[PDB]
Amino acid sequence: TVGAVVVDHEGNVAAAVSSGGLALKHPGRVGQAALYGCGCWAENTGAHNPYSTAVSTSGCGEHLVRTILARECSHALQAEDAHQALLETMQNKFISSPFLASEDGVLGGVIVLRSCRCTLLVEFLWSHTTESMCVGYMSAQDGKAKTHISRLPPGAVAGQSVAIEGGVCRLEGSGSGGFVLVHAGAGYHSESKAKEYKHVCKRACQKAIEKLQAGALATDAVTAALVELEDSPFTNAGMGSNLNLLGEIECDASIMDGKSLNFGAVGALSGIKNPVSVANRLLCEGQKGKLSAGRIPPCFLVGEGAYRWAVDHGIPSCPPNIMTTRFSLAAFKRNKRKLELAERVDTDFMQLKKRRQSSEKEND
């Protein structure tokens, strides 16, 4: 589950997110990074909105459905600071919060951005309760991009404990000014694929910076970053996604502009190279749409409808094939073997609990 957040020279934030969902999910299934406040979030500075803020989420699809973590986080940041408004959503509204009270853990990861003026101040923080998570950030005058992972202290039981890093920066507020913060998602302790994730994050941020250095909108800025993220075959989002119950590929992706508070997302969208492009197009269409262009426009298209609307305006399509990769297909064969040796033992209890009622109620 990969995502990103950004702000431009004028202090206008935006946020995006993309994911392929659970390993063997049933056909046409939408998790988070698609729903309104569960996926990304973006809000620009206003009246009882002191700060201009942006969030993205990850991790279990289910856990971030149950708290609307992205809005909740986004509404907790009206407290006097950046690093002491977040985890009150991680521990007061997630870890020890009723919304996930019948689960083995509270597995997830989030990134935040905050910004205000006096000359703009930018705060970046990334929290999670999984074994590990990766991030990357950059600024316009800064010049070179940073990467690195945010793992939990040696032997700290993941789920229970939640590690969180951060920082603060100052960008000049005339023209040459933008900052990006992206994430390659949470996971298990397979260290093998570490260097890869760190690389695609560097490339991702550079692109967004290039768009912001070209004077692009924050919405287009986060799209570019999500493109390079999806395009990578190690990310479980866009190219190289998880294979479903029928070994097919079905993505979920969202995006929000805080300036205009306009939203656009897609779900179970099969056969599209960059799901985020569709979600961006849906968000731009909402602008021109309201000004004498038919009726109320759309922003949550799904699967079959997503496919038609995408090709119909002009988004190149892929056959479930390139979107598929050696790693994913190999992962699919070993993931199908777990359900083989599980559905075969779930029909052993159904014939042994009916055989304990067969020799008492039926024989005799």
- State both tokens at 217: 């909108």
Helix (H/G/I), strand (E/B), else coil: 170: strand
Among 10, 131, 147, 199, binds a copy of itself (CB under 8 A): 147
Nearer to a copy of itself, 38 or 243 (CB): 38
163 near a copy of itself (CB under 8 A): yes
Q: Where are the alpha helices (DSSP H) in 137-296?
A: 195-213, 218-231, 275-290
**CA–CA separation, 146 and 126 (whole Å):** 14
Q: Of 242-281, which residues contact a copy of itself (CB under 8 A)?
A: 260-263, 267-268
Nearest CA to 84 out of 123, 136, 121 is that of 123
Q: Is 240 left (phi over 0), alpha (psi -120 to 50) or beta?
A: left
Q: Of 50-89, which residues contact a copy of itself (CB under 8 A)?
A: 60-62, 65-66, 68, 71, 76, 79-89
Contact segment (CB under 8 A) with a copy of itself among 23-31, 202-210, 216-224, 353-361 equals 23-31
Residue 1 a catalytic site member: yes
Nearer to a copy of itself, 101 or 192 (CB): 101
* β-bridge partners, 2: 18
Least separation in angstroms between residue 8's CB and a copy of itself is 19
300 near a copy of itself (CB under 8 A): yes
Least separation in angstroms between residue 204's CB and a copy of itself is 16
Among 78, 96, 357, 358, binds a copy of itself (CB under 8 A): 96
- AA letter at 62: E
Nearer to a copy of itself, 343 or 364 (CB): 343
**CA–CA separation, 169 and 269 (whole Å):** 38
Among 5, 13, 162, 272, binds a copy of itself (CB under 8 A): 162
Nearer to a copy of itself, 176 or 260 (CB): 260
Nearer to a copy of itself, 50 or 231 (CB): 50
Q: Of 174-233, which residues contact a copy of itself (CB under 8 A)?
A: none
Least separation in angstroms between residue 243's CB and a copy of itself is 14
- State both tokens at 7: 């702000």
Helix (H/G/I), strand (E/B), else coil: 256: strand
For 131, 147, 152, 325, 334, the CA distances from 156, given in Å and listed in that order, are: 9, 23, 6, 34, 29
**CA–CA separation, 252 and 153 (whole Å):** 32
315 near a copy of itself (CB under 8 A): no
| Catalytic residue positions, numbered | 1
